[PDB]
Amino acid sequence: PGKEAVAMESYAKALRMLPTIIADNAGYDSADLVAQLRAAHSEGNTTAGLDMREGTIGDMAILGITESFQVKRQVLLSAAEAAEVILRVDNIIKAAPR
Amino acid sequence: NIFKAGADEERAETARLTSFIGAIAIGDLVKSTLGPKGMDKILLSSGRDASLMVTNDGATILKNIGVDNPAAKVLVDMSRVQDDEVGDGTTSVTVLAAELLREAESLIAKKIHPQTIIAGWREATKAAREALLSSAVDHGSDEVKFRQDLMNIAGTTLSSKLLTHHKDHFTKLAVEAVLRLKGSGNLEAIHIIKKLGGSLADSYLDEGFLLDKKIGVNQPKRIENAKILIANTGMDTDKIKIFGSRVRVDSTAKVAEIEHAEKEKMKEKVERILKHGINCFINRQLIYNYPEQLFGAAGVMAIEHADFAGVERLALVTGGEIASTFDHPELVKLGSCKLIEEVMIGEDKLIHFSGVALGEACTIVLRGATQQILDEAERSLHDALCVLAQTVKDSRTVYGGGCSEMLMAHAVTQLANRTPGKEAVAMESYAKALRMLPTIIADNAGYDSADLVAQLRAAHSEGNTTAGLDMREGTIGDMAILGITESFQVKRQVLLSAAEAAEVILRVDNIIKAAPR
Amino acid sequence: ELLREAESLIAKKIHPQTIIAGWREATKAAREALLSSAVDHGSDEVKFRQDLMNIAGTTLSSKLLTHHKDHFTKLAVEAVLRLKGSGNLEAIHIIKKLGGSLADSYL
Amino acid sequence: YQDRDKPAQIRFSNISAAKAVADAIRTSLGPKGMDKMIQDGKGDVTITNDGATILKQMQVLHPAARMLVELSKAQDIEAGDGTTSVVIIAGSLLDSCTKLLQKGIHPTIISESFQKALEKGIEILTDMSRPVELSDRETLLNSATTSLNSKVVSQYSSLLSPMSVNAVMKVIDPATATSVDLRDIKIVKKLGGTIDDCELVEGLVLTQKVSNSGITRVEKAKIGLIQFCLSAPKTDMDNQIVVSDYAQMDRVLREERAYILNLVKQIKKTGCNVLLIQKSILRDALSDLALHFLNKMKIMVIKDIEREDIEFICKTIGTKPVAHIDQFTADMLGSAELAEEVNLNGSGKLLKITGCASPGKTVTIVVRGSNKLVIEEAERSIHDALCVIRCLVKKRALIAGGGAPEIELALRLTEYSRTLSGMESYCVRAFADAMEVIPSTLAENAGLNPISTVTELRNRHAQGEKTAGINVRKGGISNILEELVVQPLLVSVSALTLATETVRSILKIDDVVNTR
Amino acid sequence: KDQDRKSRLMGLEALKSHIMAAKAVANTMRTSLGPNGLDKMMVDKDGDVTVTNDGATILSMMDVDHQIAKLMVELSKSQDDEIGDGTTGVVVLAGALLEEAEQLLDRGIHPIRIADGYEQAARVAIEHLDKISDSVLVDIKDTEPLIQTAKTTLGSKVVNSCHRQMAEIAVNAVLTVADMERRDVDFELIKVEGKVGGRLEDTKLIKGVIVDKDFSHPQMPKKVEDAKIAILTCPFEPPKPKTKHKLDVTSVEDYKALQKYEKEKFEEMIQQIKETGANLAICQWGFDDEANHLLLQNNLPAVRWVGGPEIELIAIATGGRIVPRFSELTAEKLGFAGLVQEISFGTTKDKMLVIEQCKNSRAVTIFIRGGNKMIIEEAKRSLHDALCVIRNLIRDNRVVYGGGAAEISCALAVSQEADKCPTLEQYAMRAFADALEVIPMALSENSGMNPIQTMTEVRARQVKEMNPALGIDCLHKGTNDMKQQHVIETLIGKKQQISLATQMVRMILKIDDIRKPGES
Amino acid sequence: TEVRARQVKEMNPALGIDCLHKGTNDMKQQHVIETLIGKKQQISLATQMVRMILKIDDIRKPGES
Numbered sequence A: 001p002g003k004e005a006v007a008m009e010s011y012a013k014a015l016r017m018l019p020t021i022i023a024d025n026a027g028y029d030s031a032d033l034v035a036q037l038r039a040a041h042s043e044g045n046t047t048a049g050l051d052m053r054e055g056t057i058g059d060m061a062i063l064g065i066t067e068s069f070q071v072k073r074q075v076l077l078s079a080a081e082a083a084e085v086i087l088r089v090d091n092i093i094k095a096a097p098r
Numbered sequence B: 001n002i003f004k005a006g007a008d009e010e011r012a013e014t015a016r017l018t019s020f021i022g023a024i025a026i027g028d029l030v031k032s033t034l035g036p037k038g039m040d041k042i043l044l045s046s047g048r049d050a051s052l053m054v055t056n057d058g059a060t061i062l063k064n065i066g067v068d069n070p071a072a073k074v075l076v077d078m079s080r081v082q083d084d085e086v087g088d089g090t091t092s093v094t095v096l097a098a099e100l101l102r103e104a105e106s107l108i109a110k111k112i113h114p115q116t117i118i119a120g121w122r123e124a125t126k127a128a129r130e131a132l133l134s135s136a137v138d139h140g141s142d143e144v145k146f147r148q149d150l151m152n153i154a155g156t157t158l159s160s161k162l163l164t165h166h167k168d169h170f171t172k173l174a175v176e177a178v179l180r181l182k183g184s185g186n187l188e189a190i191h192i193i194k195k196l197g198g199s200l201a202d203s204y205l206d207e208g209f210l211l212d213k214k215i216g217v218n219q220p221k222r223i224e225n226a227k228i229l230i231a232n233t234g235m236d237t238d239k240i241k242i243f244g245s246r247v248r249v250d251s252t253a254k255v256a257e258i259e260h261a262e263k264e265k266m267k268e269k270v271e272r273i274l275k276h277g278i279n280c281f282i283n284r285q286l287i288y289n290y291p292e293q294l295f296g297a298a299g300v301m302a303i304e305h306a307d308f309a310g311v312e313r314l315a316l317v318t319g320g321e322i323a324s325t326f327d328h329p330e331l332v333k334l335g336s337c338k339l340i341e342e343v344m345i346g347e348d349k350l351i352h353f354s355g356v357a358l359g360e361a362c363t364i365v366l367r368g369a370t371q372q373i374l375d376e377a378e379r380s381l382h383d384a385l386c387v388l389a390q391t392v393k394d395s396r397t398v399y400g401g402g403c404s405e406m407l408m409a410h411a412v413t414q415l416a417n418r419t420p421g422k423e424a425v426a427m428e429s430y431a432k433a434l435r436m437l438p439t440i441i442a443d444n445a446g447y448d449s450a451d452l453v454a455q456l457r458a459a460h461s462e463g464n465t466t467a468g469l470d471m472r473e474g475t476i477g478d479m480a481i482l483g484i485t486e487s488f489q490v491k492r493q494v495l496l497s498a499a500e501a502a503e504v505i506l507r508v509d510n511i512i513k514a515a516p517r
Numbered sequence C: 001e002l003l004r005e006a007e008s009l010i011a012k013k014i015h016p017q018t019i020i021a022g023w024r025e026a027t028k029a030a031r032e033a034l035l036s037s038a039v040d041h042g043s044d045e046v047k048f049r050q051d052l053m054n055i056a057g058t059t060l061s062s063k064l065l066t067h068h069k070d071h072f073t074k075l076a077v078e079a080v081l082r083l084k085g086s087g088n089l090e091a092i093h094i095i096k097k098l099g100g101s102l103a104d105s106y107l
Numbered sequence D: 001y002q003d004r005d006k007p008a009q010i011r012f013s014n015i016s017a018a019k020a021v022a023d024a025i026r027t028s029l030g031p032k033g034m035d036k037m038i039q040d041g042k043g044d045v046t047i048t049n050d051g052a053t054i055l056k057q058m059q060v061l062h063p064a065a066r067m068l069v070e071l072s073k074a075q076d077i078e079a080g081d082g083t084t085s086v087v088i089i090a091g092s093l094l095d096s097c098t099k100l101l102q103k104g105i106h107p108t109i110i111s112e113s114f115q116k117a118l119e120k121g122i123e124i125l126t127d128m129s130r131p132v133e134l135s136d137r138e139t140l141l142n143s144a145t146t147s148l149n150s151k152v153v154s155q156y157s158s159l160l161s162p163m164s165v166n167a168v169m170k171v172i173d174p175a176t177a178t179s180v181d182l183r184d185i186k187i188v189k190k191l192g193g194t195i196d197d198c199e200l201v202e203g204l205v206l207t208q209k210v211s212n213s214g215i216t217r218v219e220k221a222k223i224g225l226i227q228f229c230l231s232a233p234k235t236d237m238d239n240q241i242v243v244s245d246y247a248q249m250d251r252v253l254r255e256e257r258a259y260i261l262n263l264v265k266q267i268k269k270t271g272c273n274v275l276l277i278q279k280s281i282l283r284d285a286l287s288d289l290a291l292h293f294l295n296k297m298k299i300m301v302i303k304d305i306e307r308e309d310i311e312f313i314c315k316t317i318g319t320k321p322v323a324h325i326d327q328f329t330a331d332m333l334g335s336a337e338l339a340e341e342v343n344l345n346g347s348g349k350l351l352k353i354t355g356c357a358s359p360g361k362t363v364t365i366v367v368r369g370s371n372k373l374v375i376e377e378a379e380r381s382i383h384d385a386l387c388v389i390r391c392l393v394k395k396r397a398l399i400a401g402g403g404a405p406e407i408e409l410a411l412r413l414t415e416y417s418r419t420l421s422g423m424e425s426y427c428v429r430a431f432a433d434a435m436e437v438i439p440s441t442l443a444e445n446a447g448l449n450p451i452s453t454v455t456e457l458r459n460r461h462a463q464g465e466k467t468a469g470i471n472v473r474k475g476g477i478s479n480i481l482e483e484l485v486v487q488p489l490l491v492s493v494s495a496l497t498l499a500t501e502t503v504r505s506i507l508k509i510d511d512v513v514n515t516r
Numbered sequence E: 001k002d003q004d005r006k007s008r009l010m011g012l013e014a015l016k017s018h019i020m021a022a023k024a025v026a027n028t029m030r031t032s033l034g035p036n037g038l039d040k041m042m043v044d045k046d047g048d049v050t051v052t053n054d055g056a057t058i059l060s061m062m063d064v065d066h067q068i069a070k071l072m073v074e075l076s077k078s079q080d081d082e083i084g085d086g087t088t089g090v091v092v093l094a095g096a097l098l099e100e101a102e103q104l105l106d107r108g109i110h111p112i113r114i115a116d117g118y119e120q121a122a123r124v125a126i127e128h129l130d131k132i133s134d135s136v137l138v139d140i141k142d143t144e145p146l147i148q149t150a151k152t153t154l155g156s157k158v159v160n161s162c163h164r165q166m167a168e169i170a171v172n173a174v175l176t177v178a179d180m181e182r183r184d185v186d187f188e189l190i191k192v193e194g195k196v197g198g199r200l201e202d203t204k205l206i207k208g209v210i211v212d213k214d215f216s217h218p219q220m221p222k223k224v225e226d227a228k229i230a231i232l233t234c235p236f237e238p239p240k241p242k243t244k245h246k247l248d249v250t251s252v253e254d255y256k257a258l259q260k261y262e263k264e265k266f267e268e269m270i271q272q273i274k275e276t277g278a279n280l281a282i283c284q285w286g287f288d289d290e291a292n293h294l295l296l297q298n299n300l301p302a303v304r305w306v307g308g309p310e311i312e313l314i315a316i317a318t319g320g321r322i323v324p325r326f327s328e329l330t331a332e333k334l335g336f337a338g339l340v341q342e343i344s345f346g347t348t349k350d351k352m353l354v355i356e357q358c359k360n361s362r363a364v365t366i367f368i369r370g371g372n373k374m375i376i377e378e379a380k381r382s383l384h385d386a387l388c389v390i391r392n393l394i395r396d397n398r399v400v401y402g403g404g405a406a407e408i409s410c411a412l413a414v415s416q417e418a419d420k421c422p423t424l425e426q427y428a429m430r431a432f433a434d435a436l437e438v439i440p441m442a443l444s445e446n447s448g449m450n451p452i453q454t455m456t457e458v459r460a461r462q463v464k465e466m467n468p469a470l471g472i473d474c475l476h477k478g479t480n481d482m483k484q485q486h487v488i489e490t491l492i493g494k495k496q497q498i499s500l501a502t503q504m505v506r507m508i509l510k511i512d513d514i515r516k517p518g519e520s
Numbered sequence F: 001t002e003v004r005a006r007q008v009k010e011m012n013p014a015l016g017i018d019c020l021h022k023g024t025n026d027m028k029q030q031h032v033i034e035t036l037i038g039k040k041q042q043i044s045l046a047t048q049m050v051r052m053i054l055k056i057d058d059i060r061k062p063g064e065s
């Protein structure tokens, strides 16, 4: 539906900022590397990633870089759940210090 | 002492802001007028109170407002071209261009070069232009369907105008004028009469190219096989368009000599006119009553007090010639007209032609309480005749109400999948600028734009290249069923003129102002 | 980053609860994408053992062991293959003694 | 929300300026309206309660506030009554809009909603009205007489009211025509005499004298209108008259007489026996020599006449304007049976011309009185009589006063909003609550409680009809139908029509741009 | 006098203040470098507005009150005569050398010592350009490749849509007004005009002169093929003054007498045209109806209302003289031309006089057409540098690969030679190397790429891959090696760039005090 | 207003608001029902608190000097 579409894009946009920050800290052009991964994965090539060693894009299957499934699943859930709590709050009640 | 005493220069940091702030301001100025539910706006010149007025025309707002910023003057001049040339899309061009620069300012904040932005917008404009070409629908046969499309396009142009309440009557006038034309879309053949009295619904029509002028004092109400001879010269009295030359007057006898000398000059000029062997004379300057009877004795129709458009329009309607001077006879093209009859509409004598060569012309007779009503009636109606004439030359049509703008924006997002890195982020902003057009049409109407516009994305993303905004009910519906459509050349020029306008601003990075005199 | 964007949406007259409805739907499609992209190893344990070295090389990044990271990829993967049980590392002792380079770490 | 861009500040700026004009003019509503003190810049001070006069003497500078001033002028032209009630209604609707805009409702939704209340509102007032017969001169007499009692002149209403009833019924077909032109009935007045002395002339009556002309009478006159000034030769450009001796000086007089007579000869050829000279001050409109030549041709001199006075003569006899003697002809002539200038004791030197014999329906009223004020209020009262009668011709109906139309309108609109769906419910309820400002203002001026008066009447209207309204003559709620305090339907309908269009127009203002 | 309130600025702070003034003009113009250069918005003093990325036009309209900036603007008058296109390369290189000098002033080096090093490094670089250069038309005069060079030049302008046609006319124009063997092409003989309407594809070459003036009558012959043209100051009619005649006719007694004298002068002079043998009679003023009625009977075309400087150019182009009065006419004072035609423009009544020679000429005018005046204005300058590109190739066909290839190769030679100069000028030579890199480093920046990564990547390619220099692909073409892209700049231009830049840096460095009296 | 109009125009029985974004209104289908004693005391306690607050026009508290 309408309003939920805009919220989904911000969720995807947040995930895209992770390789942006990984590339920025390494000193490479994060706008080119991340936008090239987006253009790649949108049409096949579901194995592309960043190559911090060479400073470009490469196939993670060939280069031999991988991470556990249980780790990424918890990172996705713990982040959305943690953000859900903060976003659901609208008023803070501070009590007197003891 | 680099730039002082009037001369100024804005550096790259400030000129980048002043260039966009000047252009974006003009967009946010008249974006409220976008759509049929557009918001009005007051115009009040400083120092004078009689200049008050209220309007929701995006073109009229930009013409009167003065502009000191050079970046804004480019965007305003590019908008006035759309109003004078095309007659529609003046507001969409200003809004689409400004929304592109608004997004571009966010891109340069991300250290995206202006040249990298321009490369993406050029590729997006091609994919966006290709979307309208595929979704465009022409009508070679089925003139009923083609006639219905002209009625829908007429309502869209007349939306948010003075004639929007009774548009159902004016849609039959403008379309009948262009339908009766059926050929070259010269709006010169389409006269617009303006006379007092009656409501807007009382606007009559005449297919014989009715005129807005009365002639002579006692002229014939019917002439058979009239030969048209147009002219432009002094024919009332002497010293026409002469200032400084005087005449000595010692007694009334010299005034009688001027009366004889006047009649002598009118006699010789009336002789040269009749030497052509004609039956109808037209002149821009007034015809005095004395030569009227000389033409009356010859049975020539003495038409007087013609305007510049009258000589420009009557020459082609009757197939005649301008022929300002008539010194030598039988050296100009005489027109062709069967009958020049008198007609009374609005308590005024009017000139009605018939059987003229190339008689596809016509005239639309407006009716109103004053001239301010008739002036705005002519402007919005002429704007409809412009795009309608363009619709005859190009029968392609596209669905409005956010269907075309959202369809083009979808192709750009598809193009963003196959493109280099930085061009993707720039093309994504080109789509958002197109999506902000229906967002503004919904916001001005009071509907939830975030719900309607986001729903159209899911609609167009999975087939359904017809969905748009239903301003009547406030929801989404098929534009074809609801009867909303716009010309292809209008949306084409709106896309290109907006991209070309914003492309000029990004290429600018430093405004230079010398010492004003 | 999710909250940084949510702050922008709230400025656009978007309710927080409407945003949570989208993030919940988005988290479903994201998990489904991981499963289709995940590639387990039911056979070819050598390929699996090769992957465990990549997990160690990725996890040990940005640490002081970058000088001899290739050595620690073998120790951590070797000690894990000896366990063959629950993930309780209480059975796996750790020793901290000075002297020698990082490549001299024994198992 | 952030609300970075704040174009709503211009709405509150236009609403506050619009509400300010209404808050000032509110207390002056009704017969018991509290007077107001206006002080001219020179030093003069005056006191009045007419809301129309107060708005003109306010010097309004804001654009939105000027729309209420021009709005009040529209009510005067259309209806001629309820000038103050319109501005009060618009100020309350905009004040009610300030509550809706804070709730997040768009001006376009508020604008379209108010039109639905206006559409249902006109049906409510039209259903509860009292139709009357226009040909029945009994209802028109008591209607204007009782209404004129509420005006300034309460004693001489019985004389001037039927003069206007006959003046309209004479020129207007009773119960056949729907439109009426007040300009077709001119009202002349001069000092001396009394209000009892009046004459409804079937022809026309003017105020200027035909002197120094000695004709004084032209029977079967073909009246004509010529704007070009008849006089000796004159040239605006640089010129010089030549005079060689006393003969040339006296010869120019013979040539000056010719130039005046040459234009008269062309007028004599058309049979025009009476000339209407437009009033002119920039040059001599009619020299002294022109008088005797016009007396020779037996033409009556009519000069120094106003264009509006010529406009009454235009439709009366069918004369057209002639800007030059060369264009003067016979087709542009009126007609007259017997022209003459009457000089009575109190009526003065009036130009009475009877027997027009032309297509047209016009009359004229002669009036007399001791002082200028005695005749001034007589003509002011005739206009309100003609205005209220004009309201009945267009809308043959009557309705009660005392704000009762606003209570029935506010009562049933609240019931109508319950059936509506969407934002129109609160927008129409706010339209209903805004109408209650009128009777609460009448109750306040009458010394009553503004709340308990309208609160009591809203129950009497739910149970009864529109007869229940505020009666200031007795100082309390009474059956207005028995008190004979009524107004035509066009006043209440045109008020909601023109006021709502102004509120919709003001609501659509997103911002104002200063041009140059 | 006027010492009070006298502006003064001296010391080392003045030199850094002068450098700050030059960097402001260089940083302003380095963005407009290359074909992808960012334009500049000009706000005229009379309210007019224009947009352009031309280095010379930016300096001309730039109203700078600083004295150091005015000297940098004066260099454009000397640079555009030789190069025309890249005046930005001199200002950018000058500002770059001055910025690097600021690092040397802090080290304690004198400004004259810095200028001595740049002059030594300029001769090192200018000597390097002569080696790596390449010829096009060595030992033979040809038109095939010479046209191709100009086609890439106009592509940098708004007229890129019609760049292929104007290049051929540019070669015939320069070859017509002067020979390649003569090696002397004069811009004064070359003129450029135009009018709104049409497109840039309708650009034409008229061997002679064109002026926006019409014939004396539309009934005149539209073709004067014979080479006999009279150029008088007055028309062949009764002589009149320059402003107003004011003939005094009291009554008919004077009319019939003066009309006979006037009619006699009508027949006398109109028949004098065929006496001297002139077919066309060009006159500063117009002809009367009696005159044109007699010209038609004699078949004598004539031009009316010709302007002041227009009458001068017609005499020069046709080879005639400005005849002051008909009595001075002769066979020698008649002009020469092969065909005179009246060319209208659609529905406009301009009808410019087109004097064709029907053979090779020595002066040629260039007529431009388009849908906008400002695009026609920028189109006029687009040929001016093309004339320099052709003129530079004619003076010397040797050229160097552009796109930054020359600057990067010279920087390596200047850097190596700096090791051989044991003196304080060594730091200035290294500064000359880094300053040379700013031109190519500015091109990559204006295109939207990483400057330093694209800079050093081409350096190692110029050192490791191959010895021939390689440029930057700023147009986003396939790759580097601009020789394949056919982007080649002239050798005389690059030498004048480094020369004028070193001169402009030398002049600003040897200046150490500015004085000016203020308003008392 | 849409729910209120449905309580008159569409049908006379009461209909609620679909806050959980279920199928539609008419909470009777959604099985969302509150106690009658709950609503009676809800608006009664609310009115009693409003009367207790409306009948207070002076909050006097001595300050520390």
Ligand SMILES: Nc1ncnc2c1ncn2[C@@H]1O[C@H](COP(=O)(O)OP(=O)(O)O)[C@@H](O)[C@H]1O
Binding pocket: B033, B034, B035, B036, B058, B059, B088, B089, B090, B091, B092, B093, B155, B156, B157, B158, B159, B160, B400, B401, B402, B441, B469, B470, B471, B484
């Ligand atoms: N009936 C309608 N339904 C939906 N949208 C409409 C309708 N009529 C006009 N519009 C929209 O209003 C916008 C402006 O129309 P118009 O006033 O003709 O051009 P401009 O505002 O540029 O003068 C168009 O983009 C069109 O999509």
Ligand SMILES: Nc1ncnc2c1ncn2[C@@H]1O[C@H](COP(=O)(O)OP(=O)(O)O)[C@@H](O)[C@H]1O
Binding pocket: D028, D029, D030, D031, D050, D051, D081, D082, D083, D084, D085, D086, D150, D400, D401, D402, D403, D442, D470, D471, D472, D473, D485
């Ligand atoms: N004699 C009266 N008794 C009761 N109400 C009256 C009386 N006269 C006028 N009113 C009320 O006062 C209001 C204003 O009347 P009026 O003064 O004629 O118009 P305005 O105040 O606009 O000039 C009307 O709505 C009418 O109902």
Ligand SMILES: Nc1ncnc2c1ncn2[C@@H]1O[C@H](COP(=O)(O)OP(=O)(O)O)[C@@H](O)[C@H]1O
Binding pocket: E032, E033, E034, E035, E037, E054, E055, E084, E085, E086, E087, E088, E089, E152, E156, E402, E403, E404, E405, E439, E443, E472, E473, E474, E475, E487, E489
């Ligand atoms: N077509 C091209 N492709 C690549 N580089 C170019 C091209 N044209 C010019 N250049 C480079 O850009 C620099 C300046 O180009 P240009 O703007 O055309 O001249 P100028 O800066 O003098 O106006 C030159 O030094 C040259 O190396």
